Write a protein that binds this ligand. Structure first.
Ligand code: BCL
Ligand code: BCL
Ligand SMILES: *[C@H]1O[C@H](CO)[C@@H](O[C@@H]2O[C@@H](C)[C@H](O)[C@@H](O)[C@H]2O)[C@H](O)[C@@H]1O[C@H]1O[C@H](C(=O)O)[C@@H](O[C@H]2O[C@H](CO)[C@@H](O)[C@H](O)[C@H]2NC(C)=O)[C@H](OC(C)=O)[C@H]1OC(C)=O
Ligand SMILES: CC(C)=CCC/C(C)=C/CC/C(C)=C/CC/C(C)=C/CC/C(C)=C/CC/C(C)=C/CC/C(C)=C/CC/C(C)=C/CC1=C(C)C(=O)c2ccccc2C1=O
Ligand SMILES: CCCCCCCC/C=C\CCCCCCCC(=O)O[C@H](COC(=O)CCCCCCCCCCCCCCC)COP(=O)(O)OC[C@@H](O)CO
Ligand SMILES: [Fe+3]
Lengths: 176, 153
């Protein structure tokens, strides 16, 4: 049975219990909108709204902010998960939408929504590393992939954000 | 603003003023609820409300479920902005009607409140004799004196 969850018991209004790993299967706070359109979001003129910064030289870091590239990323278990290789930007409302992380002790590169990063000392001083409180450095290996490296679809956005959202409940749990 | 309420016998008993307050407070209720809701899902892209309206993500779903589980019913990402729109709009619309009714249809809102049963009874703080009822009748306010009388006599 591939079904992702089962009822805790037969009474009305009982919880469901995940069968497999809830972060991978997408159950509870790890779940995503599974019917979401698998296409890129577009600017008013129809270019891809969210792209790696190297693809649009219009964008640059505001002078006197740190560039986060090359910093280590520290996961919830204090392990070094990787290092920031690239920034992805929203071209409709200029901001950094995702860090792209080269995984430490692995081949793969993964996206990391900036809502889940924080600076040491909340950016005021130091700024020598990034903190990801929500998942362990092992779990960074299972972060969902984008089909291409120059664009991201709305479904891929939902999948990636849902992965880090579930971590605060499931990262330190044997439920895997 | 104070004197208008004094002149027309306490604007708290104007039912369109009472409604206008209900919508004014409801606008603060809604924007507190909605502002907090969207910030609570902003790390999942909930602030990109136009995308969430046209292509519902998990951020929209979680916003709907929070309120459904909290209070038994929910809006959508689009329709919460209709609730927001009407509550703000109805604040000044009901307000305007209450002002137009004042001094044209009702000159004393507290007495209109007595008539229609709005006014809670309190025990009497004083009682007038029939002689006091005529003595304590005032006079309506008139013109100021346009002279400086001498009392030389
Ligand atoms: C805030 C500053 C003042 C005050 C000044 C005013 C003024 C001035 C007015 C009101 C008005 C109202 N006030 Mg009051 N009010 C206060 C404290 C309260 C408290 C409280 C703290 O518990 C409550 C529940 C109320 C409740 C109410 C409603 C009867 C009415 C519409 C409010 C509204 O739509 O708000 C926004 C909220 C919503 C849109 C959500 C829905 C709220 C519903 C309508 C509340 C119903 C409560 C019900 C009567 C009692 C429930 C308990 C029962 C035992 C079951 N007031 C304090 C003392 N209030 C207006 C009115 O119509 O007076 C006749 C009015 O003119
Ligand atoms: C003693 C005082 C009286 C009283 C007397 C009045 C009177 C009188 C009025 C109100 C009105 C209102 N009162 Mg009352 N009010 C009292 C007690 C209260 C209490 C309370 C907790 O006790 C509350 C919450 C309220 C709340 C309210 C609002 C619901 C309502 C105004 C709506 C609005 O958005 O107006 C704010 C919005 C506006 C004024 C709209 C302005 C829009 C324009 C287009 C802006 C133009 C700006 C221009 C371009 C630039 C200007 C330049 C300068 C001229 C230099 N009142 C008591 C009973 N109240 C009004 C109402 O609707 O009554 C039914 C009203 O007229
Ligand atoms: C100055 O004159 C003004 C205007 O009359 C008086 O104000 C009047 O009384 C006030 C209650 C009210 O606020 C105001 O609207 C107005 O009605 C003000 O008090 C001064 O009064 C003295 O002068 C009065 C005047 O108008 O000349 C005078 O009034 C009386 O005499 C005139 C002239 O013969 C006559 O036109 C008036 O009708 C007449 N009124 C009355 C009521 O007798 C006042 O004399 C008296 C007795 O009132 C003056 O008052 C005093 C104490 O000197
Ligand atoms: C007392 C009793 C009968 C008990 C019986 C036993 C029961 C029922 C037991 C079950 C357990 C419990 C605890 C039940 C609770 C029962 C109670 C007390 C219920 C009362 C609920 C309640 C507070 C009702 C008041 C409703 C009112 C008037 C609310 C004011 C605000 C208002 C106008 C809201 C309408 C607009 C909505 C729907 C806003 C929510 C909303 C917001 C704010 C968004 O931002 C958003 C963004 C994206 C998608 C959706 C939304 C969304 O739905
Ligand atoms: C204990 C819970 C109480 C909830 C209700 C709380 C109150 C809601 C808040 C503010 C409203 C303020 C504006 C209204 C002012 C109210 C004063 C008013 O004008 O009343 C009459 C008109 O309205 C009326 O009859 C009609 C009143 C309609 C009120 C509708 C209120 C909104 C819906 C409420 C749904 C509750 C569902 C509860 C589910 C659990 C007067 O005229 P009429 O001489 O003809 O009558 C006389 C007769 O009502 C006896 O006095
Ligand atoms: Fe909004």
């Amino acid at each position: 049975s591939d079904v992702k969850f089962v009822p805790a018991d037969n009474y009305n209004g009982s919880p469901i219990i995940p069968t497999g790993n809830p972060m991978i299967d997408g159950v509870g706070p790890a779940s995503w909108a599974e019917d979401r359109r698998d296409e890129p979001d577009l600017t008013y003129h129809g270019s891809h709204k969210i792209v790696p910064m190297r693809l649009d030289p219009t964008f640059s870091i505001a002078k006197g902010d740190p560039d986060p590239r090359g910093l280590p990323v520290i996961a919830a278990d204090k392990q070094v998960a990787g290092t920031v290789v690239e920034l992805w930007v929203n071209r409709s409302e200029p901001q950094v939408s995702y860090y792209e992380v080269q995984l430490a002790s692995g081949e793969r590169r993964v996206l990391l929504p900036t809502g889940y990063v924080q600076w040491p000392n909340f950016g005021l001083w130091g700024n020598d590393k990034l903190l990801v409180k929500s998942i362990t450095a092992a779990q960074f290996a299972n972060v969902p992939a984008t089909k291409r490296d120059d664009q991201i679809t709305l479904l891929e956005e939902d999948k990636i954000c849902a992965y880090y959202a579930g971590g605060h409940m499931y990262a330190f749990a044997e439920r895997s | 603003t104070s004197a208008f309420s004094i002149r027309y016998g306490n604007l708290y008993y104007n039912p369109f003023h009472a409604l206008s307050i209900a919508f004014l407070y409801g606008s603060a209720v809604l924007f507190a609820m909605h502002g907090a809701t969207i910030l609570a899902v902003a790390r999942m892209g909930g602030e990109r409300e136009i995308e969430q309206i046209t292509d519902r993500g998990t951020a929209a779903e979680r916003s709907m479920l929070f309120w459904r589980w909290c209070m038994g019913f929910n809006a959508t990402m689009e329709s919460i902005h209709r609730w927001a729109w009407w509550f703000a709009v109805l604040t000044t619309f009901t307000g305007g009607i209450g002002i137009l009714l004042t001094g044209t249809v009702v000159d004393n809102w507290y007495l209109w409140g007595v008539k229609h049963g709005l006014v809670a009874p309190y025990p009497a703080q004083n009682q007038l004799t029939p002689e006091q009822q005529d003595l304590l009748r005032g006079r309506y306010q008139g013109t100021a004196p346009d002279s400086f009388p001498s009392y030389v006599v």
